[PDB]
Design a protein around this ligand. Structure first.
Ligand SMILES: [Cl-]
Lengths: 240, 235
């Protein structure tokens, strides 16, 4: 009976989604913006109403949310932003393309990081071009030194996302509030993994499509009663 | 100056263009209203303003004004809190009526009272009004009590449902040293200016706040302005 909608932001500027964008605050590209607008139009056409929204503190997820709320005429909804729904922090790899990461760290290590669930990438160090940009960003000024990551394994990302799910989102759902979450590939994995009880390998194989509303139907104990559903026109929905 | 507070009134709406009374009707910004917010946002950006929290209404012309400012100053990540208590004054039965026809039919005297008297509210919005369901049945107000949901408001009414939010929700942020940005409407902001400056019924009624311009207050420890409000941008 409970309905929960997830949406993963689309394409970010400068191909950063293929360059471990991570905690760098890339904006949506105009194509990414268009993708969100189509996602929002699909929600409008399907008559979806929400009562509250959760997003990260990254502008690409926020803009995705804004674009959806505008399209569905629900700009008045309460919105809660949290760093705990941020993309995975990719450490020293942040901003590098594939050739560059291989050239830097070798195929051996890259392959290890690709498949690992709890081996973190190299920490982002003071020589990294995004070091002060991210580490000194005012939006993280309330994180303890311990909480502010220099890098994250997928397991770390999920571990700091889950508490927010549990303490902030779950209660809303239990009150029958219709939740919309606009976040990132890796933070949304955390939620799916908890919802379905997937294995570490299962979750690493899940590639959530972008720009597409992902619908969950949950029973009174917030266990899904069926597989996730994708909303959208035939061409978009097909690619999955 | 110990404290800094910034207000912004949204610019031109779609119903301003149509020459209709808006009030609680959820009219969007016109393109020119959108452009004003952008210039206001660029002014805040040029002056390097930082905020910690934002307050706005549940009305999209103000919400879009805030969004546009946040985008311009690269602070989209800020916490945003929306409340009906910052809504525009509820125009009652006048909601949706052509302003010119309203003056033609009722006369100047009567309309002046409805638009600008302090304590005399416009006629009530009755269940037969064309926008009764559109406004009074809008689920964004579903948590208001019978005694809370207005069918019309004078400026005094407006101020009276606005100040509680200000006292309970905005003042504690300010005293915590949070830098506050408020994006709202002419009448809701009138109440805040009235409270801050302690203006009289008469003075506040002749206060016409400029639109799409950052209005900057420097407050002391008691949240009393240490100087007259200032404006940001060019001329
Ligand atoms: Cl928002």
């Amino acid at each position: 009976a409970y309905k929960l909608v997830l949406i993963r932001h689309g394409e970010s500027a400068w191909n950063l989604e293929n360059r471990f964008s991570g905690w760098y605050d890339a904006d949506l590209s105009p194509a990414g913006h268009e993708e969100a607008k189509r996602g929002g139009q699909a929600l409008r056409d399907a008559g979806y109403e929400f009562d509250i929204c959760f997003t990260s503190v990254q502008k690409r997820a926020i803009r995705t949310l804004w674009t959806v709320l505008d399209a569905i005429d629900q700009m008045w909804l309460p919105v809660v932003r949290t760093w705990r729904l941020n993309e995975r922090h990719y450490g020293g790899l942040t901003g590098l393309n594939k050739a560059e990461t291989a050239a830097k760290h070798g195929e051996a290590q890259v392959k290890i990081w690709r498949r690992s669930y709890d081996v973190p990438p190299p920490p982002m160090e003071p020589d990294h071009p995004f070091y002060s940009n991210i580490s000194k960003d005012r939006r993280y000024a309330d994180l303890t030194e311990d909480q502010l990551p220099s890098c994250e394994s997928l397991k770390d990302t999920i571990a700091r996302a889950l508490p927010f799910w549990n303490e902030e989102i779950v209660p809303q759902i239990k009150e029958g509030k219709r939740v919309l979450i606009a976040a990132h590939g890796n933070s949304l994995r955390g939620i799916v993994k908890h919802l379905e009880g997937l294995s570490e390998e299962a979750i690493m194989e899940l590639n959530l499509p972008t720009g597409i509303p992902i619908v969950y139907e949950l029973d009174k104990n917030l266990k899904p009663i069926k597989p996730m559903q994708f909303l959208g026109d035939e061409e978009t929905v097909r690619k999955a």
